[model samples]
Target chain A: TWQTVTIFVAGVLTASLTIWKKMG
Target chain B: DASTKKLSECLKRIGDELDSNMELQRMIAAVDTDSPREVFFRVAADMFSDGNFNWGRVVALFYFASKLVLKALCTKVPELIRTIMGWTLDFLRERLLTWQTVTIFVAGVLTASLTIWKK
Candidate 1:
């Protein structure tokens, strides 16, 4: 399930960045 | 040639992302307004506005630079070009399964998490 893992990783990173920027 | 085609493909992907990414478009706009000599520094400054790292923007910039270099070299050394392309394809084919690729994925996640949590 590497594809799923890859997508999950990218999604988490992008989402974290988005939230972090919003909170700043 | 096959190498030319692969280089073109990479360029197109990078170009397409640059065109589509709004932040990059803003950076390009900033560059367009500046003197040619000042454009590079201006864009670099624009990229780091505020405190965030803008990892996506940095990745896009690096991708464009890498593809540009690959394109330039493709014409000068066809054999080397194919060898490079072969390795690139092999890596990409099993990218998610590779230790290096997974390590990058892990690092990106951790970096993003830490950056967000640090505030």
Candidate 2:
């Protein structure tokens, strides 16, 4: 889910959360 | 595997036109260590840098991903292709035609070729 962002919002938020959770 | 061979040949042919990217070459050689998967993602970060999509860099990434499996730098052949294609497809979709005419179309075809080229 975090690996890719489909739309801008999806991509940004998911990607942001993606960056967030990936920190672990 | 005939279909695979067709895609592989075409991708390699596309890749053949590329080889002078010394920056990419040096970067790849610089981090060839035991953490092979790291090497893949490491270059990926730069290769997919957020701006003016450089086709050469993407080509280099595909080249390295394929090369790594053969060199045994990457142990998980299946996973490597999966991850690379995942990132590549999403990146392309996210951009969604920002690049000029038919770039997306060609990019999609290239990515398709990458998928079929499978490890």
Candidate 3:
């Protein structure tokens, strides 16, 4: 099943932060 | 008065507190596959060095430890959450009286009961 808790999204968060960092 | 803000705001506060502490992140990375229980108590020492276990700090450490457990074991949801319950109760084995078991919804209030307490 797909997850809801934010912990499960750690990988996604990693990439999101990557993009945010690259934005600067 | 209804002055209290949204309950989720408290979550946000704790969530950010955990995320902002890069010092904690470094230790978490180091111990992700070793003894999660040891790391659990290590985080406990960092957050509660005085051995003072208040409701706020207890709850803080629980979430903090649970995240490490999840990462350490490469585990799932209840595995992570339940990990902390046992850890916390073990710490409370002598000094606390946890009273009756209680719960509402998806193991959420279970943590609440463990968090807010008195002997």
Candidate 4:
């Protein structure tokens, strides 16, 4: 299902954006 | 009695088919591929071969590996994780039935016997 895709995108977003912002 | 009879027949047919299909060839290919099931069963079987009774430990090893694969894939860890998870499921399934492999042999014989007896 798209659930897998959605979770993958969320993981990427979190790791790239959220984590980046928190570190910045 | 009826339920057991049906299950026994089902098991028997699978055995006959495997024999007819030349399972050894498939098994050799499975080994070369390093298939998950092959690894699991080989390891589990090896323990017995080496005169060690580490059945529980072997099961735990496989279970933990499966858990890691499932958790990683389900949580979107990575594509590799998902691939591994699928492999683990296959491995677990085969391992669970590895003990009953000989069942395939027995099943064929039993089915033939039942057929004759029923006649």
Largest TM-score belongs to which candidate?
3
| Candidate 2: C-alpha lDDT | 0.64
Candidate 1 runs further than 4 Å off: A1-24, B1-42, B78-119
- Write candidate 2's Cα lDDT for B10-118 as tens digits: 9887656555567866765655876778878877887567766888777667777776676673556788899899999999998975543244444444554454447
User: lDDT: which is higher, 1 or 2?
Assistant: 1
Top candidate by lDDT:
1
TM-score of predicted model 4? 0.21
Once superposed on the true structure, which residue ranges of model 3 sit more than 4 Å away at CA?
Answer: A1-24, B1-11, B42-51, B75-119
Query: Residue B34 CA error for candidate 2 (Å)?
Result: 1.0
Task: For model 4, state the Cα shift of residue B15 in Å.
Answer: 40
Q: Please provide TM-scores, in order, for all candidate models, with all chains considered together.
A: 0.25, 0.31, 0.37, 0.21
**Can you tell me the CAPRI class of model 1?**
incorrect
Better candidate number, 1 or 2, judged by DockQ:
1
Worst ten-residue run, lDDT, model 2 chain B? B99-108
DockQ of 3: 0.01
Instruction: List model 4 lDDT by residue over B1-119, tens digit each.
Output: 99999999998996576456666546533433324555756666666786766666665556535644554456566777777999999999999775344444445445544554576
Per-candidate local distance difference test: 0.68, 0.64, 0.62, 0.58
CAPRI verdict on model 2? incorrect
Candidate ranking under TM-score, highest first, comes to 3, 2, 1, 4
Alpha-carbon error at B117 in model 1, in Å? 72
